[PDB]
Every structure is written in C-alpha cells, then in structure tokens.
C-alpha cells in the first residue's frame, strides 16, 4: 500500500561493521595480545596477493622478432643502485635508525618536484631498513603504503588502516575511533611500532584537513610509538593549513628534494647501462637479433657527447630524470626504426646513435605543431585573425565584439577590390558562382571555422545569446599571429 517517495536499488551497501574493537573485550584486563594473534598484523593478505596471478596468462608464440635497442631501453627504464643521492640517505636512515632505537614518536616532512627520486630514494632507504629488520636485532615493525590518490574518499585511510592492521571492516567513524582507542588507551609492551608515509597531500585534504589534522593529532603521544612521514611539493602546508601554533608545537623536521646536476644525471643513466655499454654482440643475418657474450660479431655504442648535451639541456630547467630517460629511449627508437627502414625486413660492424638524433628526440618535445598547423589551414581563419589584429591596431582594445570584427572584415575586403587573390576567391563564397541562389549576410564556413578555433582553444567566447554583441577574445598573441599572417604571399602585401 505505501509508496517510497524515491528509490535507491543500484546501491551497493558494503558489509562493514559499526562496533569498534573498544566493545568486544569490555575491560582493560579483558584484552588479549595482538602480537599473539593470527589475524592481526596481516598474515592473510598474501593469499589475495596470489589469488589473481593466473587470470591473464597465455603461451602464444609465433615468429618472435627481437632487435638491438630494446634491451637497452629496459636497461634504462625506471623500474630498478644509485650513489647520486646518498647524503640524504646517510641522514634520514640515521634519523630513522636512531628513532627506532629511541622508540619515540618522531615525525618528518619532505617535498620535491616530480622527478627528484623522492619516491625512489625513500623506497630504497626503507628497503635497506627492511634488511635492517633482517638483522633481527632491531624491533620488528611494519610498513604502510598510503596512496590517497589510489584511494577515493580520503577518510578511507582509517578504513584500509584497520582492514590491513586487523583485516577488520568498518566505516571511518568507527575505525579511526577504535584506532585512537588502539593508540593512546593501549600501552607499549605489546603494541607494535608501525611506519607510515603519506603521498602527495596537495589533493588529499582539500576541504579542511580534518583528516590530516586527526593524523597529526595522533602523532603526539609518549605511550604510543609510530614513524610518520609525508610527501608534497609545496612547503608552507604544515603551517598553511594548520596555522602556526600546531605546526610549531609539534616541532617536526622539514626537507625537499631538488633538481639534480647534469653530471649526476649522466652518471646514473649510464649506471643503468654499464651492463650494456660499448658491448659487442653476435648477430644473426635475417632477424638482426642482438645476442651477447650465418652470424656476425659486431659492436654497439651510443653518442657520449650526446649524453652530455642531452643531460645538459634538461638539467637546467627542472632536473627530471624521467624526462632525461624518455629522451634517451625515444632517440634510440628513431635510430632503430630508421635502421630497420634501411633493409626492410617485414613483419610476421658498428652500430651507434648520434648527437644529431639524440637532439632530434630531445627537441621536438619543445617544437610545437600549432604553428605549422595554423600556417597550413585554409585562408579564412588567417584572414579573420588578421582582421582582429587590424582592429587591435586601430584601437588597442585587447578585445572585440562579433559585429565590430565582422565590420572590420567586410571593410578589409571591399577596400581590396584590387588584389588578385581576393579577386579570384570573390563570387564562390556567398552564393557560389551560380544563380537560383539568394545572398546571405555572412559567408559560408564562418560558423564552422569559428567553432573550429574554439575547439582549438585560441578563441574565447563568453556566454550570451545575441549573435552580434557577444564579446570575443583571442588567446595567444598578435606577434605569432603575424608569424602566420605574412607567410601568405597575398597577406603580407595587404
């Protein structure tokens, strides 16, 4: 008989509990040890780490081709020693080692540009600290990866924390509270040290930082022990979002990683290449498979001076290793494919790459296609932007209507009833040559090209309904617009 006023059936309610742990022992004496526990401290995630391995496996193989450069590409890929950034190693490893010797609640903040080896260097610091756990002389403790960006709702930190320290499922408003219960209310002798590190907080706490406020509020105990870190790019964040009293009372340590020097860059990228540097290969005669120490034995090499210029150009801007390494890989690519194009094998005794093609790879990143495109358009857009600049010359307005520019256009034409190019594009634009066709106030294709440029991004149209008085703006420059303008033989003279 009743009717619900609005339905939700595509709901996917999650089976997660509202009773915190605080209400399943009911006294201080009533509690067991988590260390003497099979389900706590994560002895069960491994099965779901291996349950899904087989889902995507095959053994198809037909006429494998394999070539010279690719092995070096994957020598050079980011998925693997480094002595370049080692004083921060010798300092933060010192701090963390002395910290777990102190069993205190210490806190640290680092930032740095994307491409500073921050995640690399840190992941390796703590790998060395894993081997220190394999010393079996330091108290065992446990890592926590925090990729809020690989999380949806930034309160899920607490949820996943509980579902990985316990494997138990709740909502944040039970989990974090049970967790405070887990932290301060719990003594030391059985609670464990855990180490945690936050990644890219610039988007995680965007509203009011009540989450991270809770976090840093957890980081101020003497009965609870933890090892906390975070990552960002900006630096004022601890005092920006909090204010000064909080960030000051906590008294943490601050750092950021910078762009590397060109020499360290080349040192390291070659450090990922010395297994293959200057090496010689046995090489078949049909597929060109480079096989190592109907077959040749040739040498391989790459332009070292090109290493110099390539690292040298991008060490000065940011210091992004990833950029350097992709430049390397793409140079190798153009070398390899030109080589293949030489012989033309199909699809079913020296080899070296040049500073010329290294820079050919490094440069087109900065060489924009927009210019050749805007030069290689039709006449109309060029004409119209030229009229725009004519107006900008007539008034110095920095902005124009539609009606004013269209007036400029018609004037810019009917003045030039004498130039030949405009003589010959004359009748075939309003009614297209023939009779039976009445005139039209505007030209053909003007709406087309308008929207074309709008999609292009150069043109900016405010929100109005009138076709005439709608204000219009250009986005780029007038100089570069002239670097399209006079490139037409007919436009330079008018």
């Amino acid at each position: 008989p009743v009717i619900r006023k609005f339905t939700k059936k595509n709901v996917a309610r999650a089976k997660k509990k509202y009773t915190p742990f605080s209400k399943r022992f009911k006294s201080i004496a009533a509690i067991p040890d988590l260390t003497s526990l099979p389900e706590f401290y994560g002895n069960s995630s491994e099965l779901m780490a291996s349950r899904f391995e087989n889902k995507l496996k095959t053994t198809q193989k037909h006429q494998i081709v394999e070539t010279i450069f690719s092995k070096v590409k994957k020598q050079l890929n980011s998925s693997y020693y480094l002595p370049a950034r080692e004083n921060e190693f010798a300092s933060i490893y010192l701090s963390a080692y002395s910290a777990i010797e102190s069993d205190s609640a210490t806190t640290i903040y680092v930032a740095g540009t994307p491409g500073v080896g921050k995640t690399l260097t840190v992941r390796e610091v703590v790998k060395e600290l894993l081997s220190s756990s394999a010393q079996r002389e330091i108290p065992d403790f446990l890592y926590v990866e925090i990729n809020g960006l690989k999380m949806v709702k930034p309160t899920d930190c607490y949820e996943t924390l509980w579902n990985k320290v316990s494997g138990e499922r709740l909502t944040w408003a039970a989990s974090m509270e049970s967790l405070e219960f887990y932290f301060k209310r719990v003594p030391k002798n059985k609670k464990k040290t855990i180490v945690v590190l936050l990644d890219e907080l610039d988007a995680m706490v965007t509203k009011s930082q009540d989450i991270m406020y809770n976090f840093f509020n957890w980081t101020t105990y003497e009965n609870a022990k933890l090892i906390v870190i975070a990552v960002a790019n900006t630096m004022d964040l601890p005092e920006r979002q909090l204010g000064n009293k909080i960030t000051s009372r906590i008294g943490f340590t601050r750092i950021m990683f910078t762009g590397y020097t060109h020499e360290e860059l080349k040192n390291i990228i070659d450090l990922r290449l010395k297994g293959l540097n200057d090496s010689f290969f046995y090489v078949d005669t049909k597929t060109g498979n480079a096989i190592l120490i109907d077959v040749r034995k040739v040498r391989l090499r790459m332009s070292a001076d090109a290493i110099e210029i390539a690292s040298r150009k991008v060490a000065s801007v940011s210091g992004d290793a990833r950029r350097a390494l992709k430049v390397c890989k793409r140079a190798a690519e153009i070398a390899e494919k030109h080589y293949m194009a030489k012989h033309g094998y199909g699809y079913d005794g020296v080899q070296t790459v040049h500073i010329t093609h290294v820079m050919k790879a490094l440069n087109e990143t900065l060489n924009s296609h927009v210019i050749t495109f805007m030069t290689r358009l039709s006449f109309t857009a060029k004409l119209f932007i030229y009229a725009l600049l004519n107006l900008m010359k007539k008034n110095g307005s920095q902005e124009q209507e539609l009606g004013d520019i269209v007036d400029e256009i018609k004037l810019l034409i009917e003045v030039n009833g004498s130039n030949k190019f405009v003589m010959e594009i004359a009748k075939t634009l309003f009614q297209q040559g023939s009779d039976n066709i009445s005139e039209q106030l505007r030209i053909i294709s003007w709406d087309f090209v308008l929207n074309q440029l709008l999609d292009a991004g150069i043109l900016f149209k405010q929100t109005m309904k009138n076709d005439r008085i709608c204000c219009v703006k250009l986005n780029i420059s007038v100089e570069e617009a002239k670097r399209a303008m006079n490139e037409d033989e007919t436009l330079r003279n008018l």
């Binding site: 039209q440 106030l441 087309f448």
Partner: protein, 106 residues
Amino acid sequence: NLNRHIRMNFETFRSLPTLKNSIIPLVATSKNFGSLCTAIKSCSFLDIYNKNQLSNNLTGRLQSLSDLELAILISAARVALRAKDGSFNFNLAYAEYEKMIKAINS
C-alpha cells in the same frame, strides 16, 4: 564542377567528413545509370543540395514574414540607432511605426 568543390573544401573547410556527408546523397538518390552519368556531370543537384542545406539560417527566414514584422523591425532598428545601447521596447516601436505610417500617408 567536382574539382571546384574539392577546391571548396580546400579553402572553405579543409576537412573531409563533411564532404563525405555531402557526397553520400548523390549516390543515395541515384537510381539508374544515365541519371548517375548526367547528374555527376552537371552536378546541378549539388545546387539543390547546398541551396537547401543552410537555407533557413538567416536570410530565407526573413524572406518569409509579413510586412507588419518589417515595419516594426524598422521601428526598432532606427530607434536603436538613435539610442546608446540600441535598447528598445514595445510601445516605442509602436510609436515610431505609426510615425512611419503617418509619413507614408502624408
């Protein structure tokens, strides 16, 4: 003719799929072979196409209206010209309209 329309895309639009759209109906109506021949020779039906294509955008729409609309639109036009922002209202146009008629009948 068809080379000239090739020119047209080369200068008007510089993009193909609109062209394919225009090209389709040519065959799409094509019924026998002598018709195909003569029609793609003259391309006189490109004329019908592109006359009825953007036919009703700005002009033919004003081509089919009463004279009353014209009188009042004039009464709006000349007074917007008299004006700063070109703003206008109902009875204003009615006034200048009747003035026009008084002049005509005078």
